[PDB]
Amino acid sequence: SQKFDVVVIGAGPGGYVAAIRAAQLGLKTACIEKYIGKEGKVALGGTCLNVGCIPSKALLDSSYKYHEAKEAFKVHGIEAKGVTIDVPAMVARKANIVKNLTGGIATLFKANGVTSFEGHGKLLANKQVEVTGLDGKTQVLEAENVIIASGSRPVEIPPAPLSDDIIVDSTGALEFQAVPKKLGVIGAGVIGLELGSVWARLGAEVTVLEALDKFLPAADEQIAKEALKVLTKQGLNIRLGARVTASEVKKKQVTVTFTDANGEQKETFDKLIVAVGRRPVTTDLLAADSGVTLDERGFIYVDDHCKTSVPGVFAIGDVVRGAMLAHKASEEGVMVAERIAGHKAQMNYDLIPSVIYTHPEIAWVGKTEQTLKAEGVEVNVGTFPFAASGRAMAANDTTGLVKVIADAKTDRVLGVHVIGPSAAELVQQGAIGMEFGTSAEDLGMMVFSHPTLSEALHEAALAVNGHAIHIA
Amino acid sequence: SQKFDVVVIGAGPGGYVAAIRAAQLGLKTACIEKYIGKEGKVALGGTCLNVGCIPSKALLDSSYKYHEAKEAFKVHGIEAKGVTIDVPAMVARKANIVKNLTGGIATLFKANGVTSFEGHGKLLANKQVEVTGLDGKTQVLEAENVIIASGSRPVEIPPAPLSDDIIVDSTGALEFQAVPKKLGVIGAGVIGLELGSVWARLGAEVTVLEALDKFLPAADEQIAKEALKVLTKQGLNIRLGARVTASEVKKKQVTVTFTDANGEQKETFDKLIVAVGRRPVTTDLLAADSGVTLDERGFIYVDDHCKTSVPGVFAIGDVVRGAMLAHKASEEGVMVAERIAGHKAQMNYDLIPSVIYTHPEIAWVGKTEQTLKAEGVEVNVGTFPFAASGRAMAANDTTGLVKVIADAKTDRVLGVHVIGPSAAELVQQGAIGMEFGTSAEDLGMMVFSHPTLSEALHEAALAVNGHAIHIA
Ligand SMILES: Cc1cc2nc3c(=O)[nH]c(=O)nc-3n(C[C@H](O)[C@H](O)[C@H](O)COP(=O)(O)OP(=O)(O)OC[C@H]3O[C@@H](n4cnc5c(N)ncnc54)[C@H](O)[C@@H]3O)c2cc1C
Ligand SMILES: Cc1cc2nc3c(=O)[nH]c(=O)nc-3n(C[C@H](O)[C@H](O)[C@H](O)COP(=O)(O)OP(=O)(O)OC[C@H]3O[C@@H](n4cnc5c(N)ncnc54)[C@H](O)[C@@H]3O)c2cc1C
C-alpha cells in the first residue's frame, strides 16, 4: 500500500505491542517483520517469543519438575520408581507453545487491524520505508511515523566462534535433542545461569566461565552472595574472573583454554554455549541519509521518550539504551504509540523489575544496597528468610530471603530484593508499593493473607523498622 | 507471679501475635494456653498452627505433587514408572512441620520476654485471670489489660455426630494414616473443599454434600461458577442443596441419609467429614460477673477496636465478629497491642483477602460483582484468562482467570478476584493497589515483568477499560 500513520519495523515485544497499541488508538498501522520461523513461514514475536523468554522458561519448568521428582519427592512420601526425561519430547512441548503463541499474536494483529508486511524493512530519508519483500519484490511505504524495533543479536567472541552444533548460542542451547554430558557456558549472566540450570538439572556437568570477579553485579550483594552459594550447590561450577583464550573443536568436543588467577587451564566440553552478551541490530536498517544517529556502541540514539534525532521516528527495545528486557521494550512500545496518538505517556525507568528464572528465582526492583551506600544514602534494611515461612515450609521450598531497603530518613521503600519462591510476584508487590510511594511501615500495616509466601514481603518491611513478628 | 500489663488468653494467631507485639511495645506480658499438643507438652500456635492453616496446606502440597507426577508429567517428557504415595510418611512430614513451628513460636516468645503460663485462664471480675494450672494448681494474676483470644471450634451436628474415626472433623481428616476409598464431606466451603481435594487427589472417591443451592456464595459469581466446574472435573462430586437427615455407622462405614431436590438418597462412605462450620469458644472463660458480654451467637461483643464492654478488656479473632481467618486474628492482635501501648492503630476490615488453597487456588479481596450490582454500583470489569499467559503456558498451568472490577464512574479498583496459579500473590498485589487507591489505569500503567503470572493482573486491569494488549 502507500501511506500509513505508523510503520513498525520488528515484531518483537517492543514492536508488536507498539503496533497493537497504535492500532487500538486508531492509527492505520503496518508492521514489517522478516524472521522466517520454524515451520517455514514468518513468525511474529521476535526473540522473546521465538528464542527467548517463552522457550527458555518452558525448559526451566520441565527440567525443574524432573529435578523435583528425582530429589524432593520422597520427603512427601512419593516414590516414583525410576523417573526419566525424554529431552526430544521436552523440547517438542516447547516448540509447540512457541508455535501456538506465534499464531496468537498474528490473530491479535488481525483482530486489531494491523497490516502485516513480510520482508526486510529499511528506513530511507523522509520516512519512507522500503520493504524488500521476501521474494525480491521491493516496495516503498510512506509513513507519517516510523517505529524502529530491530532488536538485538548474540555477541560473537573470537576465541569461541560458533562452530556447528558444538559451539552454539542462546538459540542452539535451546535446541539440544540430548543432554550434553559435560557443558560449558561463557558468561555467568541471566542467560548463562538459566541455560546452565536447564542442562545441569537433567544430568549435564556444567562449568560456567565468567570473566569478572563479581557474580551478578547488578543484583544486590546479599542476593548475589546467596545466589552463588545456592547455584554452585545446585551443580553449576561457576568460575569467576576466568578469561577464555582459545577453543579447539576436535572429535565432537571443544577445549577451551582460559586464564583465571592460577593461570591457564584448559577444560574440554561436549558443548559450549557462548552467552557473553547481545548487541543491537542496526544492519540494513537505516539508509545513509535517514537522519537517524547511532551512539558509539551501536544503539540508535534516543532521548527519554524514544524520539530519535528525526521527528516522527522513534526507536524502542534492545536497539536503544536501557535494560535489555522484554517488558522494557513493550512498555516503550506503548509509550511511543500513546505519544504518537497525543497522550503524554511517560515511562518510569526506575521501576523496571529484573527476574532470573533459576530455582530459587532471583528478582528485584529499585536500588541495590551498595548503590545506595555509594550514593551516601543511609538506609534501614529488613530481611526475612523463607525458612520462617509457614507457607514455604508446607511447600518444602525454604531457600532464599526477602530484603527491603528503606531510606533511614524518610521511611520510603527504595528497593525490594528477593531470592526464593515466587520472587517475581513478591517484587511485583513491592513495585506496586513503590509506584505509589510505600514506606516500610505502609507495607507493614497491611493485611497479608496467611499462610502465603507474600507474608515474607510483609515481615521484612516490618523488620526494616525492628518489629517483625516472626523473628526479632 | 501477680501483676502484668497484658495477660493474653489463648496462643493462636491472634493471641501469640498480640502477646509478641505487646512485649515488643514494652509491656510486661503473659499469655496463657492450655492446648496439650501432639507430644504431651502444651503447644503454642492454636488452631491455625496445630490443626488448621499449616497442616491442611502441607497435605494439599504433598497430594498435589503426587497428582502432578501421575497426571501432568508426561507432557514434559517425564515418565516416572509407577509413582506411589505412603500416606503415613506424608502425614509424618506434616507432623514434623507443625512440631517445628510450635517450637518456633515458643522461642519467639522467650526471645521477646513473654511469660508463658500453661493452663486454663478465666477472666474474673476486676481483670484478674485465674490460671487453673495444669496440675490442679490455681493462681490469680492481676492484669492491667486482658486480651481474650479463645478461638473457635467445629460445629457439631446431630445427624452426623463424631463417631470414632468414622465420622470425624477437620482434625481427624488431617490425621488419616490411609486413603479412604470413598469419602463424604458435609460442607462445601473452604475446609470442605480443601480436605476433599487432599484425599481425592490420592484416590478417594469424594462426595461433598452441601445444604445450600449456591456454591461459594461469598466468592464472586464468575469465580464460583468457574471454581465449581473445575473442582467437579477434578473429581469432587459436589451436591448442592442436599440436607443430611441421618448417619448410621455400621461395619466401619457410615450411611448418610439426605434429601436434595429429588428427595431422599442414602450414600455409604468409609469416612465422613463434618465440615459444616466453626463456633466461638467461650466455655469457662468468663466468670459470671466479669462484665464481658456475648451477642446472640456466642461471640464476645466488641466494637471496631476489639474493646469489650469492660474497659481494659479486648477480644480478638474467631470469638469476635469478622471473618474467621488467621490473618484477621493476627492483625486484630496487633491493633489491640498497639492501642494498649498508646498508638491509634486502626484495622482495615475492607481489605482482608480470602484464599482457598485448592489447585487452582481461589482468592479475592474487595467487593464481589453481585454485591456491587445489588448495591447499585455501575462497574466496569476486566477479565484475562491464564490461557493467554505465556508464563502460564510455560508452566503448563492455564486454568483460571483474573477479574478486576472497577467503579465505572471513578476508575477505582473495587475488587480483584482470581482463580488460577498464584491467586494469593496476585490478589495481594491488588490489595496493595487498593490500599493506595489504584484505578484500573494505574495498574495498567505500571511495568509488570515479562513473562510472569503477575501479568494477568496487569492485563485484566487494562481490559477493565478496553486496552488489553493480549486479548481485545
Ligand atoms: C535465551 C533468552 C531468554 C530471554 N528471556 C527473557 C526473559 O525471560 N525476560 C525478559 O524480559 N527478557 C528476556 N530475554 C531478552 C528478550 O527477548 C529481549 O529483551 C526482547 O525480546 C527484545 O525485544 P525487541 O522487540 O527489542 O527485540 P527482538 O525480540 O529482538 O525482536 C526484533 C524483531 O525485529 C525483526 N527485524 C529486525 N530488523 C528487521 C528489519 N529491518 N525489518 C524487518 N524485520 C526486522 C527481527 O526479526 C525480530 O523478530 C531473553 C533473551 C534470550 C536470548
Ligand atoms: C482445617 C483448618 C484450616 C484452616 N486454615 C486456615 C488458613 O489456611 N488460613 C486462614 O487464615 N485460616 C485458616 N483456618 C482458620 C484459622 O485456624 C483460624 O481463623 C485462626 O486460627 C483463629 O485464630 P485465633 O487465635 O482466634 O484462634 P485459635 O487458633 O482457635 O486459637 C485459640 C487458642 O486459645 C486457647 N484457649 C481457649 N480458651 C483458653 C482458655 N480459656 N485458657 C487458655 N487457653 C485457651 C486454645 O487452646 C487455642 O490454642 C483454618 C481452620 C481449620 C480448622
Euclidean distance between CA atoms A425 and A283, whole angstroms: 37
User: What is the residue-wise DSSP string for A88-135?
Assistant: HHHHHHHHHHHHHHHHHHHHHHHHHTEEEEEEEEEE-GGGEEEEEETT
Residues in A closer than 8 angstroms to B49, CB to CB, are 390
Cell readout for A355 is 527476574
CB atoms under 10 Å from CB of A85, counted, come to 23
* Residue numbers in A near B93 (CB within 8 A): 75-77
CB atoms within 10 A of CB B374: 9
One-letter amino acid identity for B10? G
Q: Is B34 in the pocket of ligand 2 (CB under 6 A)?
A: yes
Tell me: do B15 and B82 sit in the same domain.
yes
Beta bridge partners of B356: B362
Give the SS3 label for residue B237.
Answer: strand
One domain, residues B305 and B386 = no
Q: Both B247 and B345 in a single domain?
A: no
Question: Which position has the grid cell 456466642?
Answer: B298
Q: How many CB atoms lie within 10 A of CB B37?
A: 15
Residues A403 and A416: their CA atoms lie apart, in Å, by: 6
Same domain for B236 and B284?
no
Distances in whole angstroms, Cα of residue B258 to Cα of each of A345, B210, B213, B241 = 61, 10, 14, 10
d(CA B104, CA A375): 39
For helices A87-112 and A53-71, what crossing angle results, to 10°?
A: 140
**CB-based contact A10:A46 (threshold 8 Å):** yes
* B199 and B232 belong to one structural domain: yes
Answer with the one of B292, B324, B350 that is the final residue of a domain. B350
Vertex A240: Cα angle to A234 and A242 (nearest 5): 125
Among B48, B39, B40, CA closest to B16: B48
Q: Are B394 and A58 inside 8 Å of each other by CB?
A: yes
DSSP-assigned states of every residue in B162-191: --TTTEE-HHHHTT-SS--SEEEEE--SHH
C-alpha–C-alpha distance, residues B326 and B47, integer Å: 9
Q: How far is CA B409 from CA A163, B405, B438, B444, in A?
A: 62, 12, 14, 17
Q: How far apart are alpha carbons B336 and B171 in whole angstroms? A: 29
Contact list, B328 vs chain A (CB under 8 Å): 447
Looking at the structure, do residues B148 and B247 belong to the same domain, yes or no? no
Instruction: Determine whether the interchain pair B391/A57 forms a contact, defined as Cβ–Cβ distance below 8 Å.
Output: yes
Contact (CB, 8 A) for B362 and B356: yes
Distance, in Å, from the CA atom of A223 to the CA atom of B334, rounded to the nearest integer, reads: 31
Single out the residue in A276, A293, A318 at which a domain terminates: A276
A424/B429 Cβ within 8 A: no
For residues B306 and B349, the answer to whether their CB atoms sit within 8 Å is no
Q: Does residue B121 have its Cβ closer than 6 Å to ligand 2? A: yes
Say if the Cβ atoms of B78 and A61 lie within 8 Å. Answer: no
Q: B121 and B36 in one domain?
A: yes
State how far the Cα of B194 lies from the Cα of B216, in Å rounded to an integer.
13
Are B224 and B268 part of one and the same domain?
yes
- Count H helices and E strands in chain B, helices first: 13, 23
Could you tell me which of A125, A16, A77, A209 has the C-alpha nearest to residue B87? Answer: A77
Rounded CA-CA distance A11/A102 in Å is 10
Identify which of B453, B457, B459 has the alpha carbon closest to the alpha carbon of residue B472. B459
CA of A12 relative to ligand 1 center, distance in Å: 5
* B165 shares a domain with B105: no
The grid coordinates of residue B41 equal 507438652
Taking CA atoms only, the protein residue closest to ligand 2 atom 27 is B151
Q: Among the three residues A241, A276, A311, which one is the final residue of a domain in this structure? A: A276
Nearest residue to A96 (alpha-carbon basis) of B75, B79, B384: B75
Establish whether B450 is a catalytic residue: yes
Q: Which residues have a Cβ under 8 Å from the Cβ of B462 and sit 6 or more positions away?
A: B382, B440, B444, B468, B469
Around Cβ A119, how many Cβ atoms within 10 Å?
A: 19
Q: Three-state SS for A452?
A: coil
Segments of B275-412 assigned E as strands: 278-280, 313-315, 354-356, 361-366, 379-385, 401-407
Residue A44 falls in which region: left (phi positive, over 0), alpha (psi -120 to 50) or beta = beta
> Is B38 annotated as belonging to a binding site?
yes
The verdict on B95 and B41 lying in the same domain is yes
Element at A381 (helix H, strand E): strand A379-385
Q: Where does B58-113 show beta strands of DSSP type E?
A: 78-85
**Which chain B residues are closer than 8 Å to A48 by Cβ?**
450
Alpha helices by DSSP H, listed for A292-422, are: 326-340, 369-374, 390-395
DSSP letters for A172-234: HHTT-SS--SEEEEE--SHHHHHHHHHHHHTT-EEEEE-SSSSSSTTS-HHHHHHHHHHHHHH
Say if strands A243-246 and A253-259 run parallel, antiparallel, or are unpaired: antiparallel
What is the rounded CA–CA span in Å between residue A106 and residue A101?
Answer: 9
What grid cell was written down for A99? 508455535
Nearest by CB to A20, which of B396, B446, B469? Answer: B469
Report the run of H or E that residue A305 belongs to, with start and end: none
CATH assignment at residue B55: 3.50.50.60
Q: Are residues A137 and A161 in the same domain?
A: no
- In 3D space, the residue among B458, B425, B395, B448 whose CA is nearest the CA of residue A359 turns out to be B395
Task: State yes or no: A75 annotated in a binding site.
Answer: no
Structure resolution, Å:
2.8
Angle formed by the axes of helices A455-464 and A423-436, nearest 10° = 50
Q: Is the CB of B333 under 6 A from ligand 2?
A: no
Q: How many domains does chain A have?
A: 3
Domain encompassing residue B359: 351-472
Q: Catalytic residue, from A67, A76, A450, A467: name it.
A: A450
CB pairs under 8 A between A and B: 277
Residue A452's φ and ψ, nearest 5 degrees, are -145, 155
Which residues 6+ apart lie within 8 Å of A315 measured at CB? A147, A148, A149, A292, A300, A302, A306, A308
Mark whether B164 and B223 lie in a shared domain: yes
B460: domain CATH number is: 3.30.390.30
Give the residue from chain B lying closest to A106, CA to CA. Answer: B470
Instruction: Classify strands A128-133 and A114-123 as parallel, antiparallel or unpaired.
Output: antiparallel
Helix axes B455-464, B423-435, angle to 10 degrees: 50
Residues whose CB is less than 8 angstroms from the CB of residue A210 and which lie 6 or more positions away in sequence, other chains included: A186, A187, A188, A189, A192, A238, A239, A240, A241, A242
Alpha-carbon distance of A129 to A7, in angstroms, equals 8
Per-residue b/e over B254-264, b at no fewer than 16 CB within 10 Å?
A: bebebebeeee
- Are the C-beta atoms of residues B436 and B412 closer than 8 Å to each other? no
Residue A304's CB is within 10 A of a number of other CB atoms, namely: 10
**A226 — phi, psi (to 5°)?**
-70, -40
| Closest by CA position to B440, among listed B467, B422, B421, B420 | B467
Report the alpha-carbon distance of residue B446 to residue A334 in Å, rounded: 11
What distance in Å separates the CA atoms of residue A31 and residue A10, rounded to the nearest whole number? 7
Cell numbers 490442679 correspond to what residue?
B136
The dihedral over CA atoms of A300, A303, A308, A312, expressed in degrees to the nearest 10, equals 150
How many Å separate Cα B180 from the centre of its chain? 24
Contact B55, A46 (CB under 8 A): no
Residue A36 · residue B50 · CB < 8 Å:
no
Active-site residue (options: B450, B458, B467, B470)? B450
Torsion-angle region of residue A298: left (phi > 0), alpha (psi -120 to 50) or beta?
left
Burial B217-231 (b: 16+ CB within 10 A, else e): eebbbbbbebbbebb
